[PDB]
Amino acid sequence: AHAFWSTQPVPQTEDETEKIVFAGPMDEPKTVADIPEEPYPIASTFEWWTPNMEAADDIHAIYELLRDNYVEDDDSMFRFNYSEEFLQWALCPPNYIPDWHVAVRRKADKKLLAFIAGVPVTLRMGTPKYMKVKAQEKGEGEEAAKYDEPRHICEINFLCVHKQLREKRLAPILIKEATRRVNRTNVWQAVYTAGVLLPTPYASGQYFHRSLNPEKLVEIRFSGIPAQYQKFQNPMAMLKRNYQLPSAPKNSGLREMKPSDVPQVRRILMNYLDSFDVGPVFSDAEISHYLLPRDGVVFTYVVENDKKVTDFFSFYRIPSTVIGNSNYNLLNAAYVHYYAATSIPLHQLILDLLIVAHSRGFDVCNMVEILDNRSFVEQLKFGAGDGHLRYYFYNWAYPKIKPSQVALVML
Ligand SMILES: CCCCCCCCCCCCCC(=O)SCCNC(=O)CCNC(=O)[C@H](O)C(C)(C)COP(=O)(O)OP(=O)(O)OC[C@H]1O[C@@H](n2cnc3c(N)ncnc32)[C@H](O)[C@@H]1OP(=O)(O)O
Ligand SMILES: CCOC(=O)CN1C(=O)COc2ccccc21
């Protein structure tokens, strides 16, 4: 039993989403008028709260909750520690709906107890490409293309319930209130990812990791020395040696992105992203927002030659609490953001990504095998990790697609 998710407009089994052919909603059509206006009911010792994410103090309250109760690895060794500046960036993109930030706090003391966030995204989510072959083979093309327009939908992230309130059916309530807040905005779909398995992903992929500073990584037990460095002399010298990287970017005319680069970056990004079944459409302002550099949060580099931007790469920082350990406090991880390459092999672009990230003192580079990510795993010495990021839609029938057919990076 999924007592909550069986009541929801998502596919219920693997046997379902295997036999789904066309993209489209699950539910009855409805209207804003059908949606209660009053927040969902809750125990009287609690209340709903809309944080103002342009207030240091609301942001901080969310920051503390996540720092202490947000996602942990399987082995309870590391926990995400999204910075404050990062939460402002992630939760307040252009035309964000403040109302989609849903928090529950105790009435008495106003201790924040749970949080879920929605942000707007414009997403291509019509029938995949392969499934549109099938639909010419069968004369069903107009059914298949029905919902090809980019849709303005909700991107849910940051679900979190305080450690003390777990197993108390509090996250379903959170999800119904967000659903409601977003329905009242005349939005009927959402996209979200989970480390865990839910009904029912349309795509799933491995996480990959790339040692930048293996000495710390072994120290904090993020990595072990693999059993074959024992047969060596000073094992940690070999390890350091294997993951060593140039001090400086290899592509001449790599430099940080600037505001004047926005249109060019947008363009080559959209042409690249367009070639995936599921992917975001960004306007200029979204491009400025998600990709212009911010100290400690997001780092973006472009390749210019002949005052011509031909390639870009970007990554964002999420530091993680090292949960055991007295020696070290934080894991300083970089995550491969969007990129696009037109003048150079992608592995050569992303190598400079690793170089920059290492010289800025990051410990590790992380990704999921979305995009053409898989195409540089071997040469750049990434290794698969434990677990899988799953991608899900709410109220949207979608066939199972490969993860290299997904172009949405989830913060
Ligand atoms: C159109 C508008 C739509 C907008 C909304 C779209 C949907 C948004 C969907 C949300 C996308 C979030 C994406 C992310 O942010 S993924 C990150 C999720 N957060 C964490 O992992 C942080 C650490 N963990 C926690 O804070 C809690 O364990 C959470 C909050 C995860 C569950 O709290 P708790 O452990 O106290 O459980 P409960 O007793 O209250 O509730 C039990 C029910 O919750 C179902 N559950 C467990 N984990 C997840 C999960 N990650 N997504 C969705 N559902 C989940 C579970 O199957 C069970 O239901 P059912 O099997 O009985 O049916
Ligand atoms: C062994 C993974 O450690 C991390 O890279 C950091 N991390 C966290 O701290 C929280 O749990 C995660 C889940 C999925 C991806 C990354 C992380």
From TrEMBL:
- Domain Glycylpeptide N-tetradecanoyltransferase C-terminal spans what residues? 219-402
Q: Which residues form the Glycylpeptide N-tetradecanoyltransferase N-terminal domain?
A: 26-203
Enzyme nomenclature, EC number = 2.3.1.97
Which molecular function term from Gene Ontology is one that the record holds? glycylpeptide N-tetradecanoyltransferase activity
> What is a single cellular component term in the Gene Ontology annotation?
cytosol
Pfam families on file: NMT, NMT_C
Return the annotated region ranges for Disordered: 1-15
Annotated binding of CoA, by residue: 2, 4-5, 161, 167, 169, 171, 193
Catalysed reaction equations from the record: N-terminal glycyl-[protein] + tetradecanoyl-CoA = N-tetradecanoylglycyl-[protein] + CoA + H(+)
Residues that coordinate or bind Mg(2+): 165
Claim: Transferase is one of the keywords in the record = yes
What are the UniProt keywords, alphabetically? Acyltransferase, Metal-binding, Transferase
Q: Which family does it belong to?
A: Belongs to the NMT family.
Extract the PANTHER family matched here: GLYCYLPEPTIDE N-TETRADECANOYLTRANSFERASE, N-MYRISTOYL TRANSFERASE
What is the recorded function of this protein according to its Swiss-Prot or TrEMBL entry? Adds a myristoyl group to the N-terminal glycine residue of certain cellular proteins.
User: What is the official name of this protein in its record?
Assistant: Glycylpeptide N-tetradecanoyltransferase
At the highest ranks, the source species' classification is:
Eukaryota, Discoba, Euglenozoa, Kinetoplastea, Metakinetoplastina
Record gene name: NMT
